[PDB]
Amino acid sequence: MVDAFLGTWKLVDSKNFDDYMKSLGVGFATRQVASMTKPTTIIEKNGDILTLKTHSTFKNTEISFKLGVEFDETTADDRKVKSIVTLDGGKLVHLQKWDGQETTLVRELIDGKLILTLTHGTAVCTRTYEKEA
Numbered sequence: 320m321v322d323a324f325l326g327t328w329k330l331v332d333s334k335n336f337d338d339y340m341k342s343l344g345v346g347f348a349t350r351q352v353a354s355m356t357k358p359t360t361i362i363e364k365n366g367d368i369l370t371l372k373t374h375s376t377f378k379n380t381e382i383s384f385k386l387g388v389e390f391d392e393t394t395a396d397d398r399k400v401k402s403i404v405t406l407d408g409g410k411l412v413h414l415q416k417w418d419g420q421e422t423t424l425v426r427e428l429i430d431g432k433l434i435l436t437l438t439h440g441t442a443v444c445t446r447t448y449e450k451e452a
């Protein structure tokens with residue numbers, strides 16, 4: 320069910336990521352470096368455990384989870400959140416909750432590209448990744 324998401328993905332387009340980071344309270348210097356990084360996202364499965372790595376010259380992260388089971392997460396910007404990832408409409412939907420706040424990280428495949436939509440507050444960001452062979 321998640322299998323077309325698996326693999327190594329490289330960032331090839333970003334829209335409104337500064338808006339998203341600023342909504343989350345990320346400081347200007349961090350937003351500045353993040354606006355020029357191009358992460359690699361690696362999505363691997365082992366049985367029903369998924370591991371999602373995000374690698375860059377600035378910040379690395381890694382999470383492991385089962386679909387539909389809440390997990391603790393510490394984000395790249397150091398928020399301690401309660402997370403859950405599920406498949407919804409063929410999209411991989413990651414919801415983070417903290418301090419009564421929420422943000423969603425939604426991944427959808429369109430013409431072989433992975434489109435990540437990041438929503439917090441009113442800010443909506445769309446990032447596009449292409450597979451690596």
Ligand SMILES: CCCCCCCCCCCCCCCCCCCCC(=O)O
Pocket residue numbers: 330340343345349352353356358360373374375376377378379380394395396435446
């Ligand atoms: C988990 C993302 C880590 C790699 C980040 C790229 C280099 C620096 C960015 C981190 C800056 C703090 C803002 C983080 C906000 C939260 C996660 C955004 C992930 C975006 C993506 O996966 O394309």
